[PDB]
Amino acid sequence: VHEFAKELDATNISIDKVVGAGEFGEVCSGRLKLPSKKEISVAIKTLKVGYTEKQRRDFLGEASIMGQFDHPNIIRLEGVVTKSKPVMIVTEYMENGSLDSFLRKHDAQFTVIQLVGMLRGIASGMKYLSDMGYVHRDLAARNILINSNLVCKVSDFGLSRVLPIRWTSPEAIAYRKFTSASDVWSYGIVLWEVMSYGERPYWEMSNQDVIKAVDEGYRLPPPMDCPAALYQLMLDCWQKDRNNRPKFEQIVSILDKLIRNPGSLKIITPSNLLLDQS
């Protein structure tokens, strides 16, 4: 873990608040005093008391991965604490939490340009992540964190691997073909989640029907008041042929253009899912 993660001194960490419960323990907020004496807000994951050796390797595995990425749109690892207890993972603090829960609180309250900014950040992080040879495999709004200034960052590298049905590409479902192109599929789902202000992909459809419908060519319908440009980008991301999906670099390019000319977004778009003939 120490190849990519600094060991932090626990005396430099203050825990101010328990903010939630994670797979391996509590999630807290607090402060970290840096070697320069500067103090920053951080989030802290603790490893639960009584952990097995396996839980420890799995827990810290997320830090080893996170530690490899230094990018404004990937959650920043400040370090770990292993030489004292409890065992900790320390990251930058993301005040507005997971993106899907944040958007659910603010239905229809942001501008299209604001949403596109969010979407651009996610794509830029994923562009870097794919550049680095990593397939995330669990790209979803719930795994995106958003900070006080609405900057969105890819997080949760639990299932991430060196090269969740609703977010997974058909080919990855069919025979575990995970590529960066299957992450792009997932991105298309995230894009739908954002424009839907945190509605659940495919709502509560049975898993078997999600698989079958998507395979038959059905796609999530356009979110309310969704710009045609953004809905078509979802469709491009959801191409049956993974070869035909845009690369993350192209997605970033597309979103940089939509940001540049807000006039672009003014065009607005027999079953609940739509049959995309393409």
Ligand SMILES: Cc1ccc(-c2c(C)sc(NC(=O)CCCC(=O)O)c2C(N)=O)cc1C
């Ligand atoms: C390694 C890692 C990964 C993600 C986080 C993290 C969560 C799982 S949740 C949250 N931030 C919030 O929930 C904001 C709550 C706001 C409030 O309580 O007022 C974070 C995070 N990075 O801030 C944490 C770690 C350590």
